[PDB]
Amino acid sequence: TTATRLTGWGRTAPSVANVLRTPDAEMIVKAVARVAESGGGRGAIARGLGRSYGDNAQNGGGLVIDMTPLNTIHSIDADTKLVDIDAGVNLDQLMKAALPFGLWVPVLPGTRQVTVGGAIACDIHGKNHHSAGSFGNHVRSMDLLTADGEIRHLTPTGEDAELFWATVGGNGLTGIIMRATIEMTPTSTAYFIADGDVTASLDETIALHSDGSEARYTYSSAWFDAISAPPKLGRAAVSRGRLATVEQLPAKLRSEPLKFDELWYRKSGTYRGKVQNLTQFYGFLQYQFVIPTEAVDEFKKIIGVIQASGHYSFLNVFKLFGPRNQAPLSFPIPGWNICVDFPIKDGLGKFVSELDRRVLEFGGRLYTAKDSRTTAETFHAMYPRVDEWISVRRKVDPLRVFASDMARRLELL
Numbered sequence: 001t002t003a004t005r006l007t008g009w010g011r012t013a014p015s016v017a018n019v020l021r022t023p024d025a026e027m028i029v030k031a032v033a034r035v036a037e038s039g040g041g042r043g044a045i046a047r048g049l050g051r052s053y054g055d056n057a058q059n060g061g062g063l064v065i066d067m068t069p070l071n072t073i074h075s076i077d078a079d080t081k082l083v084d085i086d087a088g089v090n091l092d093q094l095m096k097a098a099l100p101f102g103l104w105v106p107v108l109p110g111t112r113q114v115t116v117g118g119a120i121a122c123d124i125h126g127k128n129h130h131s132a133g134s135f136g137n138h139v140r141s142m143d144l145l146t147a148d149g150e151i152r153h154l155t156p157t158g159e160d161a162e163l164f165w166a167t168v169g170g171n172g173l174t175g176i177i178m179r180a181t182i183e184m185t186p187t188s189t190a191y192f193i194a195d196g197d198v199t200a201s202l203d204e205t206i207a208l209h210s211d212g213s214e215a216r217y218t219y220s221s222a223w224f225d226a227i228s229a230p231p232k233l234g235r236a237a238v239s240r241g242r243l244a245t246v247e248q249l250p251a252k253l254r255s256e257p258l259k260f261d262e263l264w265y266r267k268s269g270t271y272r273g274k275v276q277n278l279t280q281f282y283g284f285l286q287y288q289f290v291i292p293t294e295a296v297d298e299f300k301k302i303i304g305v306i307q308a309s310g311h312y313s314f315l316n317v318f319k320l321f322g323p324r325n326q327a328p329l330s331f332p333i334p335g336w337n338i339c340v341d342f343p344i345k346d347g348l349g350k351f352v353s354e355l356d357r358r359v360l361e362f363g364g365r366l367y368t369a370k371d372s373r374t375t376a377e378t379f380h381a382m383y384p385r386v387d388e389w390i391s392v393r394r395k396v397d398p399l400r401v402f403a404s405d406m407a408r409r410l411e412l413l
């Protein structure tokens with residue numbers, strides 16, 4: 001092991017600890033058990049490609065097990081739609097291996113450079129959340145390495161269904177996911193057909209997302225404005241699409257269907273049925289929150305608060321979430337989700353602390369993947385069933401040999 005201080009993706013909150021990089025499966029197993037004996041000291045935390053901005057992947061003075069050397073793809077079946085992978089395999093890797101089977105990764109985030117281990121541990125969501133939900137909805141079985149040195153085979157139903165949905169979005173505190181089986185989405189091509197729309201106000205963006213035209217597309221998101229003053233505030237560049245069928249694909253592309261390789265602003269944004277690949281279709285404080293669908297006025301308010309703030313975010317992603325899964329600590333809930341990132345300035349930390357209160361007041365929540373600064377008080381209140389979740393954690397890990405900086409910060413230990 002090499003003693004390395006580790007930060008999030010946004011180069012924040014360094015945590016000096018040991019990095020255990022090994023492809024060997026049983027060398028990992030021993031490290032944990034040989035740690036559990038001594039007792040939860042600093043404990044240990046699994047780490048993927050470190051794409052979450054938070055201190056969820058960092059341990060301070062403890063052990064940080066790197067999962068990336070354990071990246072075996074065991075089997076891909078095209079008939080059963082099943083994929084059996086080690087937790088250390090990434091999505092870019094998996095997406096490339098699945099296409100020759102005519103299979104697509106069920107949930108894709110922004111960057112594909114995320115591991116399966118980290119994908120479940122955050123219960124990550126994508127552009128098709130309104131149609132497919134989060135990543136945990138597609139996990140069929142996990143092989144979790146618990147605290148006592150044993151490995152438990154978990155599933156959505158039956159035994160360990162309680163521990164399963166705890167690991168889904170459990171930020172790696174329940175254990176170390178070693179091996180996962182994923183349900184895949186079948187596909188005829190590796191392309192998308194998209195409909196482009198440009199709104200001129202927040203009211204348009206909301207109406208467009210609520211008039212039921214969303215039921216026409218599987219994938220959808222919106223590049224929106226949070227700087228411009230009302231009524232220009234909230235105006236969005238919407239990108240809504242669907243997986244392309246072999247028939248829909250232009251004459252040249254059909255040959256290799258599964259291969260991988262202010263007026264001006266409005267008209268360029270507006271189009272219909274346009275065929276485009278995955279790449280085309282897809283210092284600073286990153287901030288993400290969701291607000292329940294029925295609380296639309298309160299949402300209109302937060303955007304205005306952001307507008308008047310004196311803080312100017314330009315990278316602004318807008319999304320309407322679909323139904324939630326049954327995971328206690330899953331971030332997504334049916335509502336208006338938006339991410340913003342601000343430039344670090346004076347009074348930012350206190351302003352976002354007011355957005356915490358404001359978001360909490362309307363029954364929404366923040367995403368653990370992007371959080372490094374919300375309090376334990378705010379987090380716990382944002383997540384009902386957090387107590388339920390903790391009572392499960394004490395059964396599986398009663399020594400606190402699984403602990404990250406976040407778990408200490410949010411008192412989830």
Ligand SMILES: Cc1cc2nc3c(=O)[nH]c(=O)nc-3n(C[C@H](O)[C@H](O)[C@H](O)COP(=O)(O)OP(=O)(O)OC[C@H]3O[C@@H](n4cnc5c(N)ncnc54)[C@H](O)[C@@H]3O)c2cc1C
Nearest residue numbers: 048049050051052109110115117118121125171172177369
């Ligand atoms: C540019 C960019 C865009 C993004 N877009 C999105 C998006 O649209 N939607 C979205 O939901 N997220 C998004 N993310 C965040 C990212 O998808 C998640 O935070 C993801 O979980 C990080 O994966 P990772 O492998 O890097 O895990 P890490 O960041 O290394 O660790 C995060 C968590 O995963 C856990 N973990 C990792 N491996 C294991 C294992 N084997 N066993 C147990 N626990 C484990 C850790 O305990 C930790 O709590 C984005 C990130 C970036 C940088």
Ligand SMILES: *N(O)c1c(C)c(C(F)(F)F)cc2nc(C3=N[C@H](C(=O)N4CCCC4)CO3)sc12
Nearest residue numbers: 110111125126127221282317318319337338339
């Ligand atoms: N918020 O950070 C966020 C959200 C909420 C969503 C979605 F759709 F789930 F609501 C998607 C999403 N995608 C993000 C991202 N896209 C960027 C990207 O790929 N680029 C293309 C142009 C600029 C960079 C990087 O991360 S953030 C995000």
